[PDB]
Design a protein around this ligand. Sequence first.
Ligand code: NA
Ligand code: NA
Lengths: 10, 10
Amino acid sequence: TXPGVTXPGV
Amino acid sequence: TXPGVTXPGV
DNA sequence: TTGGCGAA
DNA sequence: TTGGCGAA
Ligand code: NA
Ligand code: NA
């Protein structure tokens, strides 16, 4: 996720 | 780092 | 080398 | 499979 917590996605 | 941005370190 | 974050 | 986050 994120960042943070990529995306999702990407 | 962090998380985010572990530690460092660990 | 290790940390393992945080879903679609 | 991809994203590549962010130093000691
Ligand atoms: Na290294
Ligand atoms: Na998977």
